[PDB]
Design an enzyme around this catalytic site. Structure first.
Site, short mmCIF file in Angstrom:
data_model
loop_
_atom_site.label_atom_id
_atom_site.label_comp_id
_atom_site.label_asym_id
_atom_site.label_seq_id
_atom_site.Cartn_x
_atom_site.Cartn_y
_atom_site.Cartn_z
N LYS A 248 0.83 -1.20 0.00
CA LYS A 248 0.00 0.00 0.00
C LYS A 248 0.87 1.25 0.00
O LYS A 248 1.99 1.24 0.50
CB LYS A 248 -0.93 0.01 1.22
CG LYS A 248 -1.99 -1.08 1.19
CD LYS A 248 -2.89 -1.00 2.42
CE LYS A 248 -3.94 -2.09 2.41
NZ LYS A 248 -4.82 -2.04 3.61
N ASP B 173 8.09 10.99 -4.91
CA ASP B 173 8.04 9.84 -4.01
C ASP B 173 9.10 8.81 -4.36
O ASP B 173 8.85 7.61 -4.31
CB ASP B 173 6.65 9.20 -4.04
CG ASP B 173 6.31 8.49 -2.75
OD1 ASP B 173 7.07 8.64 -1.76
OD2 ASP B 173 5.31 7.75 -2.62
#
Ligand code: MI1
Length: 286
Positions: A15, A130
């Site tokens: 996730k 990210d």
């Protein structure tokens, strides 16, 4: 394209932010001869979050590169993103479990593929936002891909930065100081984060040695939980920095530290990074 009824759940793969990743078999013939894919869904569906999902999907669909994970298609009900499944998992877990079969020379090979894929991003005016080994994916022993684009944006079109502040939790120990203080993301902030990636690789993902652990030690786990961002902004201001990893050659650590320039404009480019990495590589071979 991809039908929901023909998609069998195998396991949880990850996730990230507001997505989850599952290993499913696509089996339209229902004869267990279908192909194993990865499916990303929103972990909790929103209108805002899905507006954003549909973009991430267009972003990935627009990428065709050896070092970028591979859009296969989509699936409604409701919205799901089908990618190629890569059997060795995230670079993070791979390197942790298998430290082992991975020498410095391999780390620079990955590093170099991370640069090439990031340079392709820059070609398109995409800021990843990210970069972290957990978002890198291992295709085989010799090949990595950038594996997730959940926070990726396009650069506005007069402007070389993109300012974004997102609800909840940011990976602040991978953030460039300008992203912490000003919420500005650019290729150069990607390069800051690339340096941290490179540090992770060289630490072999030793837990005590993670960026948070290191920075938290440098700050004081007896600081706070909310002034954490303030203290980290200060620390970086005063040129506090992630230590050179055990074993790291000074010249890889120099790459790292040059990526952690407080001066956004003095950080190297991904093309330069790849040139220098590829080259340190060669001197390590013969
Ligand atoms: C490293 C990959 C990118 C981040 N991951 C997420 O679950 C993020 C979200 N949300 C896990 C994923 N992973 C372990 C995968 N593992 C194997 N194949 C994959 N294809 C696409 C992702 C993927």
């Amino acid at each position: 394209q991809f039908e929901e009824r023909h998609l069998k759940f195998l396991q949880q793969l990850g996730k990230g932010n507001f997505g989850s990743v599952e290993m499913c078999r696509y089996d339209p013939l229902q004869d267990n001869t279908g192909e194993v894919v990865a499916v990303k869904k929103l972990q909790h569906s929103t209108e805002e979050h899905l507006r954003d999902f549909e973009r991430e999907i267009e972003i990935l669909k627009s990428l065709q590169h050896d070092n970028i994970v591979k859009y296969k298609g989509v699936c409604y009900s409701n919205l799901k993103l089908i990618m190629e499944y890569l059997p060795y998992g995230s670079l993070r877990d791979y390197l942790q479990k298998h430290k082992e079969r991975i020498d410095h020379i391999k780390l620079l090979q990955y590093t170099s593929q991370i640069c090439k894929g990031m340079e392709y991003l820059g070609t398109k005016r995409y800021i990843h936002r990210d970069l972290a080994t957990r978002n890198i994916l291992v295709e085989n022993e010799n090949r990595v891909k950038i594996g997730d684009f959940g926070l990726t944006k396009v650069l506005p079109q007069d402007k070389e930065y993109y300012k974004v502040k997102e609800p909840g939790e940011s990976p602040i120990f991978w953030y460039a100081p300008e992203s912490l203080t000003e919420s500005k993301f650019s290729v150069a902030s990607d390069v800051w984060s690339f340096g941290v990636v490179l540090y992770e690789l060289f630490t072999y993902i030793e837990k005590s040695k993670s960026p948070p652990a290191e920075f938290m030690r440098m700050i004081g786990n007896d600081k706070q939980g909310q002034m954490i961002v303030f203290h980290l902004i200060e620390l970086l201001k005063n040129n506090g920095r992630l230590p050179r990893p055990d074993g790291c050659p000074d010249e890889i650590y120099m790459i790292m530290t040059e990526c952690w320039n407080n001066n956004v404009n003095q950080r190297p480019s991904f093309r330069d990074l790849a040139l220098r990495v590829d080259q340190i590589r060669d001197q390590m071979a013969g």
